[PDB]
């Protein structure tokens, strides 16, 4: 029982509420270009989702089961969805900005000039309302969220509860490699920008490539492990699972450092 | 064995390393006196983290500490636990007397402050420190196995004698820093009464910073130092739990001093 303990979630909401908070502070302060704006709500999307679901865990510590806390069901049910929701939105929110920085670097002409907040504010809006709809189908008989081992957390039940399981999984391996084919693209377009000019202009270019290369690192880590897992009980494995969406938590953690708070900690063929 | 998990000195090697590096960037890119000192702490926090993490890690993956050290090493790690912890806690005590001396004197402070001093008290502190932590070998003190056998401390029960200089020391800087802080609280705040907004926003963004470190303080150390003084005249458990709390405040330590600012930067009577 290594990691049945109250001290991990504990930990969790306090680091990811004071990184989020600092975030949303910088972009409140600084504007509201389309950037800040996708950041400043993807801080506050993570955040949402993290006092929404840590309070519930750390009562049934406390408490000593989700039974005798919860009959009928009716907090396991909206504990399973408000996992799902918040999870798809932080990945597809960065494959969004993933997008966004593809088509930036491709044509800085019209982007410049075209690019306007309210589109920023109809992505934003798309993909709460998308991954909201996919969440209300265990509600709709399509899936079913039952409680998890060991008795603190409800998520996805894994063994058309089977379709349901693997339509998340799915999702989540296409948010990833929307992102990961959009980020090696714009560091190739970069950095061949870069030799056709050949320290300023080089600088630049190799810190917005550290920039991408670990915004894919950090969702490689803390994804991989539960998207693949759910894949293997689909077609210790109680243990192993709970350190996986622990995993999958650590990347709402990570947020709000691997876009604003890192840059602004280190901000400040001899122009070249 | 909730407590009895490898994760917890992974993730604390981890996050100490992060903010105790990026730390000791930003004061290289700056060799005053308050960078020098705060540059030299995060040094001190990270060797104690690299000099201890790796050996708790190799104990936790092998599954006991008597078969792997037949005890030269269980003494030299209680040691090193001894010289970075008291280190720490007198390297922030010699700060807050540096505060207090400056606004209590900011024309003397400033023109007869020298490097010289700062190295003096940072050199004195260290080998104090490591004087303090030979007691054992030289037979005063002991340091035996821990549970759950992953560590090494001083043994609580002249082993009481040296138990308890170590708690006794640190309720010693635990007062100085408090005391220095709330004095120089109250040296600011009528400074600042006495000439009524730049004025006003340095004194209070200042009185955050005293204040946060008393709380850093008091939440990481009390707990470790007083379980100690009540062994000497569940056991187990909690005072792992206090080892850990007490180790907290070495990670917190660049965040508290240096990063917090850097993400947040930017009757006499706008200058009010
Ligand atoms: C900014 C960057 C900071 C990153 C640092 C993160 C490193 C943190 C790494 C780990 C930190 C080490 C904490 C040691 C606690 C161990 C407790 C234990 O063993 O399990 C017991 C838990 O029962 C409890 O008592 C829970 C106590 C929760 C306190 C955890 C620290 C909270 C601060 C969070 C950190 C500060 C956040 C705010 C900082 C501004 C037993 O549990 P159970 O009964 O079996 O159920
Ligand atoms: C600026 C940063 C602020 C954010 C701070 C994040 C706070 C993170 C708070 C807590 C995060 C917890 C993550 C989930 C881990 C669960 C593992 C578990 O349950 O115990 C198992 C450990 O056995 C293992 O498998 C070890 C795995 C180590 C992963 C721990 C995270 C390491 C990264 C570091 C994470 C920080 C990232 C560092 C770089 C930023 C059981 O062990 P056993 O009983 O011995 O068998
Ligand atoms: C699929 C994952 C999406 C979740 C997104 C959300 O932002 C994360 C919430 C996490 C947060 O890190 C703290 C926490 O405990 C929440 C629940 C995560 C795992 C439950 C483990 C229960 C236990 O500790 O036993
Ligand atoms: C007296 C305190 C001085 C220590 C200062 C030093 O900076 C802290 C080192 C800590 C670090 O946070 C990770 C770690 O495990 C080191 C040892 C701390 C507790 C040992 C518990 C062993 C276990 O987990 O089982």
């Known amino acids: 029982c290594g990691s049945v303990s109250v001290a991990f979630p504990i930990t969790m909401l306090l680091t990811g509420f004071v990184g989020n908070a600092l975030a949303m502070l910088l972009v409140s302060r600084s504007y509201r270009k389309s950037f800040l704006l996708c950041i400043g709500w993807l801080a506050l999307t993570d955040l949402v989702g993290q006092l929404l679901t840590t309070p519930v865990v750390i009562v049934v510590y406390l408490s000593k089961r989700w039974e005798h806390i919860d009959p009928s069901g009716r907090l396991c049910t909206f504990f399973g969805l408000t996992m799902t929701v918040f999870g798809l939105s932080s990945l597809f929110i960065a494959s969004a900005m993933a997008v966004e920085r593809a088509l930036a670097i491709r044509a800085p002409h019209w982007y410049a000039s075209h690019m306007k907040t309210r589109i920023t504010r109809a992505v ?34 894994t063994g058309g509860n089977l379709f349901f399981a693997s339509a998340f999984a799915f999702l989540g391996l296409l948010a990833l490699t929307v992102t990961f084919s959009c980020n090696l693209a714009t560091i190739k377009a970069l950095v061949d920008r870069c030799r056709a000019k050949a320290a300023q202009w080089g600088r630049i270019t190799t810190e917005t490539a550290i920039q991408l290369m670990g915004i894919m690192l950090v969702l490689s880590v803390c994804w991989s492990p539960l998207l693949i897992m759910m894949l293997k009980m689909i077609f210790k494995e109680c243990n192993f699972f709970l350190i996986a969406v622990r995993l999958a938590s650590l990347n709402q953690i990570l947020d709000p450092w691997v876009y604003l708070l890192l840059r602004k900690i280190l901000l400040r063929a001899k122009y070249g």
Request: charged share 0%.
């Open 124 to 157: 934003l809006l798309g993909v709460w309302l998308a991954s909201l709809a996919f969440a209300l189908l265990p509600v709709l008989g399509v899936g079913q969220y039952t409680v998890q081992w060991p008795g603190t957390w409800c998520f996805i039940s």
